[PDB]
């Protein structure tokens, strides 16, 4: 006979979803500014339309996205293997190989074959082909159903070949699907450990040992992936908010008056610009207002020089005596003004030059002759018990704000500073006023030394550890705490600062008013330095390195406050306990989740419908009644549903029965299916307007066998509502197979196909002694036994033949002794083919691939490569018919036992 698939079909294998990921350069010489590059491409095996998209980038023209160009690839005749994305291991499914005939008026007769694959259980075996001949009318298609059972997980391959009769046209498709284990994917949380190296762990490091995945529902021998998620937790180091600029709108003052009155109006405007420039609140305050106040600062410096005495000193009038405090305060305001506006520096250094020649006793004391007419501007220095030490600290701070600007001008400045610092240390431990210790606490922290005890007295004089307070007007205490903040920010201490700034903010002092010169200038110079130098966040910087015994390297991650790698995932397919070492500052979160295959119900099939399919031989060669009963599992009746009916090979439905079903009230069979020919009609869809949830809706129609076939593949019925194909239910029907399932032998989620023969079919007379030795001496033949059938345990799934090992002709990988028993398994379809009788003897050999259970309970399977030959008894050999066989068997044993197998 002719195998039409002899056409040497090279099946189509290339549904890439995308390709041609190429980069070309238009180097050809341009014609009218257009370069044309010709490019040879090899189209893939897909039968579809490709959309080719091109994007160009040019140095002189920029980016351009071309219009999509389409290429359609087609054949007249071709196979479309409708393969699902995934299939569960050992679950029986029906794939569809759709064959298309786009000939205009030629009806094709095609021979189509499903190729055998040991990874699947189908009608195709190693010794039998699943070939069939179908008819495809012109401009039509026919779906060829194939029933398979995947037997091993992974990417498995299905190949279908076809060749048409009387035309030299052939085609083949070779696609692949994923075989996923009977469980369902599930994820569990392994650990959630918070990382904080400065609160947990020791010596600055934190070691966290992670336990391996604690799964107990996992399907045996399945892959699991553990995902390590290192993620930094951002916080907002904490810093105290700046004062809202809306409360500071009243500090913009036009300076006027004499030498003391001009500085009163100049102070709130210089310190407001200084504080608003540092905090950058001009956007929320009015960017236009910045220049107007900048001119009022110039107006203050312009009118203050009118009262600068020719001796480089400052007094209220040009005829007034100079002051040590007023001169030192002009140095304090002009120094902080240089950063925004400047005109003359010899005015600032000229006042510092006079401040040391005339008002510096070698004791280091600054004494006030007091021509200060306005006692408002003095601040806490007024009404001070230790007015002598508080003034030495006030002038000393003024020299420092101008020290970096008058270092070369006034070369005697570091001498007076050291002398002023010497006087403060001596009588620092004798002060009893909180204002003196505060201003002289910033006067000795500024580029100076406060002794351990002096620092202790400075920190212990803070009542409630947050504020500096003393009997007197509160503007003295607000000024004092402002000096104590500039000291804590000069010493770079930040553990005592938060409660100090919080108190300053809760004071709600926004400057301005009568006698507020010192209080307004210091409270916003200190709060500006707090915003200038500050540790918005809490400084996240974690150096977390994980040491995994799964690899030979340690992966580390510097989790800065930088937003480049806030979280970084590390997948590790190996499930092993690893170590997480984390050190640094800040907080972080570690998440370890493992995905795995959890064993559950494979109960995921038929979760929305009940489906009962019965095939009965109720009475042109054969005629059976296919009955289908279905019921929806909801609280209400289901909507429009589909009955995807598949015919068993060789059968077609009765046309008159379908026309009567199509006339139903709640049923619809399309006119397309009713006009189809009787033959080449193996699929059918009966549409249901509704399917009840209370009772089973049953329909039935007769099916006729128009073509006799040796092997009948089970038909299938599939129910689903139109809006959800995933929620379906498929039942198989076949006269003479349990629930429509193909024959397979399963044990502990491991199945092997049982659609093979049954055994090696070579006749006992066509085999010779040399043919037995040549077959048995192959390395594939593991065991060669002489057995005696003891018991035949008949079962409906498979027959068990308990054999006593009469003689070990060739011992295999199974250490069995004479007298012991081994079970030989064969499906019930081979019960009549084997014809095994109890207490009879047999010669048996087979492959080591036919072993089944574990070594203590090892079972043998009688497959297509198992030799089973009747061994007649010694007395039976006296017949002339058995003479030939007994001479072979007796010689076969002596040749194997005494001399073995050469090579």
């Amino acid at each position, epitope marked *: 006979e002719d195998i039409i698939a*002899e*056409e*040497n079909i090279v099946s189509r294998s290339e549904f890439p979803e995308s390709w041609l990921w190429n980069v070309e350069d238009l180097k050809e010489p341009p014609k009218n500014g257009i370069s044309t590059k010709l490019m040879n491409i090899f189209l893939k095996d897909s039968i579809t339309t490709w959309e080719i998209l091109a994007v160009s980038m040019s140095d002189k023209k920029g980016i351009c996205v071309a219009d999509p160009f389409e290429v359609t690839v087609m054949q*007249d005749f071709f196979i479309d293997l409708r393969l699902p994305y995934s299939v569960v291991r050992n679950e029986q499914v029906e794939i569809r190989a759709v064959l298309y005939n786009y*000939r205009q008026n*030629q009806e094709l007769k095609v021979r189509v074959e499903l190729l055998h694959n040991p990874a699947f259980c189908s009608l195709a075996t190693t010794k039998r082909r699943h070939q069939q001949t179908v008819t495809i009318p012109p401009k039509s298609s026919l779906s060829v159903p194939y029933v398979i059972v995947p037997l091993k997980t992974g990417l498995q391959e299905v190949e279908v070949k076809a060749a048409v009769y009387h*035309h*030299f*046209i*052939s085609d083949g498709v070779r696609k692949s699907l994923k075989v996923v284990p009977e469980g369902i994917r599930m994820n569990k949380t392994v650990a959630v450990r918070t990382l904080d190296p400065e609160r947990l762990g020791r010596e600055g490091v934190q070691k966290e040992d992670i336990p391996p995945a604690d799964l107990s529902d996992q399907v045996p021998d399945t892959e699991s992936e553990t995902r390590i998620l290192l993620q930094g937790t951002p916080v907002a180091q904490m810093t105290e908010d700046a004062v809202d600029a809306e409360r500071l709108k009243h500090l913009i003052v036009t300076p006027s008056g004499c030498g003391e009155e001009n500085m009163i109006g100049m102070t709130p405007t210089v310190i407001a610009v200084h504080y608003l420039d540092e905090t950058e609140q001009w956007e929320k305050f009015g960017l236009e207002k910045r220049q107007g106040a900048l001119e009022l600062i110039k107006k203050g410096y312009t009118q203050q020089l009118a009262f600068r005495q020719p001796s480089s000193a400052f007094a209220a009038f040009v005829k007034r005596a100079p002051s040590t405090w007023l001169t030192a305060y002009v140095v304090k305001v002009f120094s902080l003004a240089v950063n925004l506006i400047a005109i003359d520096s010899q005015v600032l250094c000229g006042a510092v030059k006079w401040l040391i020649l005339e008002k510096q006793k070698p004791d280091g004391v600054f004494q006030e002759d007091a021509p200060v007419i306005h006692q408002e501007m003095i601040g806490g220095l007024r009404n001070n018990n230790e007015k002598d030490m508080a003034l030495t600290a006030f002038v000393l701070i003024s020299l420092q704000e101008a020290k970096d600007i008058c270092e070369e001008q006034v070369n005697s400045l570091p001498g007076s500073i050291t002398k002023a610092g010497d006087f403060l240390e001596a009588n620092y431990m004798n002060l009893q006023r909180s204002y003196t210790v505060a201003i002289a606490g910033y006067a000795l922290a500024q580029m100076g030394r406060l002794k351990g005890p002096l620092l202790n007295k400075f920190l212990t004089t803070a009542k409630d550890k947050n504020r500096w307070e003393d009997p007197g007007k509160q503007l003295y205490n607000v000024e004092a705490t402002s000096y104590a903040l500039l000291a804590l920010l000069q010493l770079k201490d930040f553990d005592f600062v938060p409660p100090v700034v919080r108190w300053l903010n809760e004071q709600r002092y926004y400057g301005g008013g009568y006698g507020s010169t010192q209080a307004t200038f210091m409270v916003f110079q200190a709060l500006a330095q707090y915003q200038k130098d500050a540790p918005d966040h809490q400084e996240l910087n974690l150096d977390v390195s994980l040491q995994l015994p799964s690899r030979s390297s340690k992966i580390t991650h510097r989790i800065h406050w930088e937003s480049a790698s806030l979280l970084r995932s590390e997948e590790t397919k190996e499930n092993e306990g690893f170590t997480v070492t984390a050190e640094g500052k800040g907080q972080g979160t570690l998440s370890v989740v493992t995905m795995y295959h959890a064993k559950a119900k494979d109960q995921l099939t038929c979760n929305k419908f009940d489906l009962k399919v019965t095939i009965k031989p109720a009475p042109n060669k054969n005629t059976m009644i296919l009955e289908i009963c279905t019921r929806y599992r909801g609280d209400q009746d289901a909507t429009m549903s589909i009955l995807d009916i598949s015919m068993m090979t060789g059968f077609a439905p009765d046309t008159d029965d379908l026309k009567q079903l199509a006339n139903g009230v709640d049923r619809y069979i399309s006119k397309y299916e009713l006009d189809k020919a009787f033959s080449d009609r193996n699929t059918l869809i009966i549409y249901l307007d509704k399917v009840s949830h209370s009772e089973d809706d049953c329909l039935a129609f007769k099916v006729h066998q128009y073509f006799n076939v040796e092997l009948i593949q089970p038909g299938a019925v599939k129910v689903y509502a139109y809006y959800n194909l995933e929620e379906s239910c498929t039942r198989f029907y076949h006269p003479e197979k349990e629930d429509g399932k193909l024959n397979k032998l399963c044990r502990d989620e491991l199945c092997r196909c049982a659609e093979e023969n049954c055994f090696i079919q070579k006749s006992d007379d066509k085999v010779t002694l040399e043919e037995r030795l040549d077959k048995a001496c192959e390395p594939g033949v593991d065991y060669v036994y002489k057995t005696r059938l003891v018991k035949v345990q008949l079962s409906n799934d498979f027959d068990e033949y308990i054999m006593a090992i009469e003689q070990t002709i060739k011992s295999g990988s199974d250490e069995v002794q004479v007298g012991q028993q081994r079970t030989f398994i064969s499906p019930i379809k081979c019960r009549e083919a084997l014809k095994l009788e109890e207490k009879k003897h047999y010669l048996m050999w087979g492959l080591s691939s036919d072993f089944w259970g574990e070594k203590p309970n090892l079972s043998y399977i009688i497959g297509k490569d198992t030799w089973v030959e009747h061994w007649p008894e010694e007395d039976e050999c006296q017949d002339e018919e058995n003479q030939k066989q007994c001479q072979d068997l007796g010689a076969f044993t002596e040749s194997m036992v005494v001399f073995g197998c050469p090579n």
Partner: nanobody
Amino acid sequence: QVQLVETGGGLVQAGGSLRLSCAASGSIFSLNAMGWFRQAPGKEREFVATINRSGGRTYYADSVKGRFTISRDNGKNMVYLQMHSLKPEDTAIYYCAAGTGWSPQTDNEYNYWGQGTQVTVSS
């Protein structure tokens, strides 16, 4: 496209034999049908033999059914037609043609033909 060149023809006696070689322009691979056609003087162009793409299937006309043998070499881009046991009724111009595979026994599915060669079998 692809064109063909026929060689191997000539003059022969009544009883003898000769084989005709067909040379292809491009790669003959992936071409399903390769057929030989002949046209006798005073007669119409008739079908002779087709060969499969891989060479595993052939079709012959009843007049030359058991006397001609078509073969192809896809690696050499060649088609052959071994003519044995000649008859004086086989005198014709022999054409080599490329086909699509559909209906390989008719000329309506051959779009690329050759020059042809004269094979005169004298009585």
